Design a protein around this ligand. Sequence first.
Ligand SMILES: [Ca+2]
Ligand SMILES: [Ca+2]
Lengths: 223, 220, 220, 220
Amino acid sequence: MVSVIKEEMKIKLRMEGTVNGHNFVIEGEGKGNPYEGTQTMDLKVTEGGPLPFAYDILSPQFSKAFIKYPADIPDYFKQSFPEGFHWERVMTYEDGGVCTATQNTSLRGDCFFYDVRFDGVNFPPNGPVMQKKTLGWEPSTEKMYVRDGVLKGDVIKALLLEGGGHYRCDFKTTYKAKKDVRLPGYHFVDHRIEILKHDKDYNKVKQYENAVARYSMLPSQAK
Amino acid sequence: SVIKEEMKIKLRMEGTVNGHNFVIEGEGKGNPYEGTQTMDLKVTEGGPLPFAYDILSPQFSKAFIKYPADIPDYFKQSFPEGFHWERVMTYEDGGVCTATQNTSLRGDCFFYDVRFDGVNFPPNGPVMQKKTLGWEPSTEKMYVRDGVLKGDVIKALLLEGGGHYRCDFKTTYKAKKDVRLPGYHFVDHRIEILKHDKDYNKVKQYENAVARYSMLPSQA
Amino acid sequence: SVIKEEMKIKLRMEGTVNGHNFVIEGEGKGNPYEGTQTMDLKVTEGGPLPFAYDILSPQFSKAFIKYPADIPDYFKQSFPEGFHWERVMTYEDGGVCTATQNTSLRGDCFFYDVRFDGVNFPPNGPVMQKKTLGWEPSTEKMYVRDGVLKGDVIKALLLEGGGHYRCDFKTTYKAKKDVRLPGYHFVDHRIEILKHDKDYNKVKQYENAVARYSMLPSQA
Amino acid sequence: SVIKEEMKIKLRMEGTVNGHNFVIEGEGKGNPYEGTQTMDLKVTEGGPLPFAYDILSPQFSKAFIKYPADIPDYFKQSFPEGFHWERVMTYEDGGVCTATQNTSLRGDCFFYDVRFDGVNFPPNGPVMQKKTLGWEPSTEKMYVRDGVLKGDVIKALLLEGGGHYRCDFKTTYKAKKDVRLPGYHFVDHRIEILKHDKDYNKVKQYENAVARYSMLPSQA
Ligand SMILES: [Ca+2]
Ligand SMILES: [Ca+2]
């Protein structure tokens, strides 16, 4: 327990972005259990819908305070409050599409406020993103390590495709606390992001993420 | 033809680099058929920029390439409707920038609206430490893919400490109407800062750009 | 069936890193169904190696992954015919390695033949200066593509002085016969050096590898 | 000088692509100060090659670049001792090739020893399906890094049926003795297949290479 982060917390989100020159805005509202690593958010496309690209490319941009951290791994995100943190992200898809995102996370009362900027370029016109042939993300494990006094997270994620097969994306994120925090050693955050409900064009989406931090499953054999 | 031999330019860029928001406005003039242009840039919000201005200069003009008669001019043909472009810029130390640009035309003036975003620049790298000294001249490689025009180019910034800092550009240019598509070709560029104040709040920038095929004849 | 509870391994690697040619011979043994193995490696040509031995250790064994019954085991299913694999390793400072490996089976012994090549390592980087302190444990992501099995993983080497040195692994595993293909899954790995002489001409290394689905339950 | 107006070439390459081993021997001759050369290549083991021969042609000669007097010639200066080079070749569909080359000189003949390795080529991509129609001409960008010479270039294979297939080349050239280092410059290349037999077991190829600065004058 950190007194400023309660056992149940609310979320409010705004995203502005551009994908292949198409502008859009998304608003979100959610709530979760930060120490349980679970959360649900309801997302609504408010400008630019129906999105001409796969909703899936956005869903990982929608919450690092909701990771279940064991007591022995320092929690970069929960320690950063009340000041909060921002993050910066590159997503390199294997067919030349590239997305950047910058996010600000602040805290007021029992509510987290997320402001996201998202930009995607060079998606092929007949590729799975602009043809909306994706079917959600496989579960993944982000690798968290310190670089220049801030926290990096890297993971190769994969979208399931219509017809089978996968579509890969290299995530490189830098997380930057707005005050000094105890820094963790190298570790893993398992993630599983799921779409619980969507309308036909994904104008209205309920999504859920479960995230848990850990060291490796395998024992050390160090001599 | 709706493009005169001398045209004005108006530009607005908004963006975020390393989490820092900024706005730049620009006015310029150029000779579209000569391949040359000059533009005056003012940082109107978020100044002084905490990162090297150089990462922005190549985002500030495709109608001002000198195209020979035997290479279709994808950009000039697109008017009056215009075109937009999309770009990823991958720096060798992990900094990555994206940019999206819309080009429209009214009267004797092109209007440029640019969104620019940079992430993951190392804090002691040359961009965040402002150690850059302008771009080398370069040669963009231009080729059609899926009915639009791509341009890829190896670029390099000169460094205060010596050596170069490398950036790979991959751009997609998308005309807003059907045009005569060009074959594979090259555009030589040289972007130069003519004048800047100490903090690069005000910058006078120049570019020369010329399309061509290879300088080397074919053997048979 | 052809794969017993204990199996021997014989290995030959021929390679060039930074223009330096070398040969490594290895003999090992392990328990394929338990996901464990030990190997003794000797640099027989080109030692002492002028680069970090760590870049080699992940090149030294896919039959030794503990596979649960509900995930098809691509590697064990491929025998007696065996499989080969192809790998690119992209280091964050510009070093790139490739490797091609053939895995065959004769009696109770696996035979590994590996070609390894490393190019463009910076002369003052951690690989050429031997500043690495082993790999962090990792999780390979395995997924089918074009009828064969790919594995992707971002790995990290620990560095003298603190911090990590990242490497993007992209492997394609290709069975020499038709097998049941698995769905998307994970293989946890931990590679450890048990013993080494001063210049790493002689190394005993150990690996534990276990395949699994996600740790997290699904809510759909 | 040790480098005459006409020089012979002898070459051997050993390689593995998509798990397929091969050996190629070559002999050629050229005019180092004119920037031109011709080579006859023969697949001596592993023919017929199951992949596009085009991926090999750029691995077959930097002493044959026409250098003007005001750019130091990194390669010619290195003789009689010579140089070696290292290269990564990242194709847009995930194929990656590495190569390491040693260049020596005896009498009036250059001796080239090449290792080549290609991995992760998609089985229905243009390389494994032999759908390529040679390289577009290109401009390699030369610059000093860590006391040696780097060359980076955007290259593109023309494809049967139209379109291009891109490959990024990153090379490090390493003289075996210290030489006068050049400033940032450009080497235009045009590499062409003049003649081949049915299975590309025998190939005659030609290259023209000329070093220069930018075409465009400085305004600043
Ligand atoms: Ca790098
Ligand atoms: Ca690709």
